[PDB]
Scaffold this active site. Structure first.
Site, short mmCIF file in Angstrom:
data_model
loop_
_atom_site.label_atom_id
_atom_site.label_comp_id
_atom_site.label_asym_id
_atom_site.label_seq_id
_atom_site.Cartn_x
_atom_site.Cartn_y
_atom_site.Cartn_z
N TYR A 41 -0.35 -0.22 5.08
CA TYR A 41 0.89 0.27 4.51
C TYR A 41 0.82 1.77 4.26
O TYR A 41 -0.24 2.33 4.04
CB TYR A 41 1.22 -0.41 3.18
CG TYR A 41 0.42 0.04 1.97
CD1 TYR A 41 0.81 1.12 1.18
CD2 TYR A 41 -0.74 -0.62 1.62
CE1 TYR A 41 0.07 1.55 0.10
CE2 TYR A 41 -1.49 -0.23 0.52
CZ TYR A 41 -1.07 0.83 -0.25
OH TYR A 41 -1.91 1.09 -1.29
N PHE A 51 2.56 9.81 -2.62
CA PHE A 51 2.29 9.09 -1.38
C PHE A 51 0.99 8.31 -1.49
O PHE A 51 0.04 8.71 -2.17
CB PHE A 51 2.05 10.00 -0.19
CG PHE A 51 3.12 11.05 -0.06
CD1 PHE A 51 3.09 12.21 -0.85
CD2 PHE A 51 4.17 10.89 0.84
CE1 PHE A 51 4.06 13.18 -0.72
CE2 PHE A 51 5.16 11.86 0.96
CZ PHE A 51 5.10 13.00 0.18
N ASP A 52 0.97 7.14 -0.86
CA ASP A 52 -0.17 6.26 -0.96
C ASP A 52 -0.26 5.53 0.36
O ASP A 52 0.74 5.12 0.92
CB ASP A 52 -0.08 5.30 -2.14
CG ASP A 52 -1.21 4.27 -2.17
OD1 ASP A 52 -2.36 4.67 -1.93
OD2 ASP A 52 -0.96 3.08 -2.46
N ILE A 71 4.44 -5.52 -6.52
CA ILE A 71 5.82 -5.44 -6.97
C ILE A 71 6.64 -6.55 -6.29
O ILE A 71 6.29 -7.03 -5.17
CB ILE A 71 6.41 -4.04 -6.74
CG1 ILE A 71 6.28 -3.59 -5.32
CG2 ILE A 71 5.83 -3.04 -7.74
CD1 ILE A 71 6.98 -2.30 -5.03
N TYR A 97 9.14 -0.81 -10.32
CA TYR A 97 8.64 -0.57 -11.67
C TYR A 97 9.71 -0.34 -12.74
O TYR A 97 9.35 -0.03 -13.88
CB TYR A 97 7.67 0.62 -11.63
CG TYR A 97 6.50 0.39 -10.70
CD1 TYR A 97 5.37 -0.31 -11.11
CD2 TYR A 97 6.55 0.81 -9.36
CE1 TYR A 97 4.31 -0.56 -10.27
CE2 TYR A 97 5.48 0.53 -8.50
CZ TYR A 97 4.36 -0.14 -8.95
OH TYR A 97 3.29 -0.42 -8.14
N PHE A 114 8.35 1.92 1.65
CA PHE A 114 7.11 1.54 2.30
C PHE A 114 7.32 1.20 3.77
O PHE A 114 8.35 0.66 4.12
CB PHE A 114 6.49 0.28 1.72
CG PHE A 114 5.95 0.41 0.31
CD1 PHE A 114 6.78 0.26 -0.79
CD2 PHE A 114 4.60 0.73 0.11
CE1 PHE A 114 6.26 0.28 -2.06
CE2 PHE A 114 4.11 0.80 -1.17
CZ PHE A 114 4.95 0.61 -2.24
C1 LIG Z 1 -3.33 3.81 -5.15
O1 LIG Z 1 -3.05 3.28 -6.47
C2 LIG Z 1 -1.77 2.89 -6.75
C3 LIG Z 1 -0.76 2.72 -5.78
C4 LIG Z 1 0.54 2.31 -6.11
C5 LIG Z 1 0.85 2.04 -7.45
C6 LIG Z 1 -0.18 2.19 -8.45
O2 LIG Z 1 -0.04 1.92 -9.76
C7 LIG Z 1 1.29 1.59 -10.13
C8 LIG Z 1 -1.48 2.57 -8.09
O3 LIG Z 1 -2.46 2.74 -9.04
C9 LIG Z 1 -3.64 1.85 -9.08
C10 LIG Z 1 -3.25 0.52 -9.21
C11 LIG Z 1 -3.20 -0.46 -8.18
C12 LIG Z 1 -2.75 -1.83 -8.38
O4 LIG Z 1 -1.51 -2.28 -7.77
C13 LIG Z 1 -0.34 -1.62 -8.39
C14 LIG Z 1 0.78 -2.30 -7.82
O5 LIG Z 1 1.07 -1.62 -6.57
C15 LIG Z 1 2.10 -2.21 -5.82
O6 LIG Z 1 2.60 -3.27 -6.12
C16 LIG Z 1 2.58 -1.45 -4.67
C17 LIG Z 1 2.38 -2.18 -3.36
C18 LIG Z 1 0.92 -2.36 -3.02
C19 LIG Z 1 0.37 -0.98 -2.68
C20 LIG Z 1 0.48 -0.14 -3.94
N1 LIG Z 1 1.85 -0.15 -4.57
C21 LIG Z 1 2.28 0.96 -5.20
O7 LIG Z 1 3.38 0.88 -5.71
C22 LIG Z 1 1.60 2.24 -5.06
C23 LIG Z 1 2.53 3.48 -5.16
C24 LIG Z 1 1.80 4.82 -5.43
C25 LIG Z 1 2.75 5.88 -5.38
C26 LIG Z 1 3.55 5.98 -4.09
C27 LIG Z 1 4.32 4.70 -3.88
C28 LIG Z 1 3.43 3.54 -3.86
#
Ligand SMILES: COc1cc2cc(OC)c1OC/C=C/COCCOC(=O)[C@@H]1CCCCN1C(=O)[C@H]2C1CCCCC1
Length: 124
Positions: A41, A51-52, A71, A97, A114
């Site tokens: 992804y 960005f991630d 999410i 969120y 995404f």
């Molecule tokens: C690389 O680290 C991160 C990436 C996302 C969110 C994060 O915390 C909310 C985050 O911080 C660490 C925590 C990770 C644990 O999962 C958080 C939940 O993340 C998600 O549900 C979605 C989908 C799976 C990949 C990560 N996700 C995130 O929203 C990313 C974000 C980070 C900022 C740009 C938009 C994506």
């Protein structure tokens, strides 16, 4: 093109999660709730400030579908995808969120984008 394009894949039909298939997948099976899912992804805030990508970790991202480890948009979105499919998801805050946000990464009421490639899935 318009911002709010894609198939509304929400149950409520509130255009909270819009999907575009960018690369069609193979086989007729989409994953079942509870399947272990393997993806690559690239994600971002719509404001472009963050960005991630799974590639930053240099390995597929793995999660159990429909268990709320991700999410809402992901649990709904990846359930629709075929193995090998690449899809884009435009996601309003209600399916990400929300009004609380998730600081410092995610501000209140953020829209997320995404690109997700479904690599594989296995019945646990
Ligand atoms: C690389 O680290 C991160 C990436 C996302 C969110 C994060 O915390 C909310 C985050 O911080 C660490 C925590 C990770 C644990 O999962 C958080 C939940 O993340 C998600 O549900 C979605 C989908 C799976 C990949 C990560 N996700 C995130 O929203 C990313 C974000 C980070 C900022 C740009 C938009 C994506």
């Amino acid at each position: 093109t318009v911002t709010e394009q894609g198939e509304d894949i929400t149950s409520k039909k509130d255009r909270g999660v819009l999907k575009i298939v960018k690369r069609v997948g193979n086989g007729e099976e989409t994953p079942m709730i509870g399947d272990k899912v393997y993806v690559h992804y690239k994600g971002k805030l719509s404001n472009g400030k963050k960005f991630d990508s799974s590639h930053d970790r240099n390995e597929p991202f793995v999660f159990s579908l429909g268990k709320g480890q991700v999410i809402k948009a992901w649990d709904i979105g990846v359930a629709t995808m075929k193995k090998g499919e690449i899809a884009h998801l435009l996601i309003k805050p209600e399916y990400a969120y929300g009004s609380a946000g998730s600081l410092p990464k995610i501000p209140s009421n953020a829209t997320l984008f995404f690109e997700i490639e479904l690599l594989d899935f296995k019945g646990e």
